[PDB]
Amino acid sequence: GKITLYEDRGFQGRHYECSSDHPNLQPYLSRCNSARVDSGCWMLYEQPNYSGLQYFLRRGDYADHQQWMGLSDSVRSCRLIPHSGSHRIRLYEREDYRGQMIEFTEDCSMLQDRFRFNEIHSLNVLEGSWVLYELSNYRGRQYLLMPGDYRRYQDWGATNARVGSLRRVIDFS
């Protein structure tokens, strides 16, 4: 799809349009305080090369970085998350796909209501892309998951295994 990132709030100031992954927005955008997501699902990153804090944006209007739960106006790379028509993920109690496992094909806002573990230590993203959230109801630190193996929580960019919720990356329109 396409996303337009603006240096000032309210879709004001200098801006830059992306249609694909961009690993270093720094020459083209000195800060980001609003965004318009016309189409697609996007992950914004605080640092270049898809690192630092992550923020999931779907289509729609974001007049402040707080509306994507952004903690600062730093946005220095972004990913266009490939569309998927189906979603399936396996979440594991322990590293390397060991221990008890819970499987999802739908969103889960309250992981601890379905799984009696505060942590997920590995997971397997069989179908579609997801966003994993530190806290229930899609809050806290966010980690983009794309199809593939995640043998350790460090493989999704986390410094611990805390998980409270997870959502499918779906374009709503």
UniProtKB/Swiss-Prot annotation:
Effect caused by changing residue 23 to S: In CTRCT4; reduces solubility
GO molecular function, one term: structural constituent of eye lens
Gene Ontology cellular-component annotations: cytoplasm; nucleus
Residues in Beta/gamma crystallin 'Greek key' domain copies: 1-39, 40-82, 87-127, 128-170
Keyword vocabulary terms for this entry: Cataract, Disease variant, Eye lens protein, Repeat, Sensory transduction, Vision
Reported effect, residue 42 to R: In CTRCT4; much less stable than the wild-type protein; more prone to aggregate when subjected to environmental stresses such as heat and UV irradiation
Outcome recorded upon mutating residue 58 to H: In CTRCT4; lowered solubility; crystallizes easily
Pfam families from the UniProt entry: Crystall
Family: Belongs to the beta/gamma-crystallin family.
Disease: Cataract 4, multiple types: An opacification of the crystalline lens of the eye that frequently results in visual impairment or blindness. Opacities vary in morphology, are often confined to a portion of the lens, and may be static or progressive. CTRCT4 includes crystalline aculeiform, congenital cerulean and non-nuclear polymorphic cataracts, among others. Crystalline aculeiform cataract is characterized by fiberglass-like or needle-like crystals projecting in different directions, through or close to the axial region of the lens.
Function, in words: Crystallins are the dominant structural components of the vertebrate eye lens.
Subunit structure, as described in the record: Monomer.
Protein name, entry field: Gamma-crystallin D
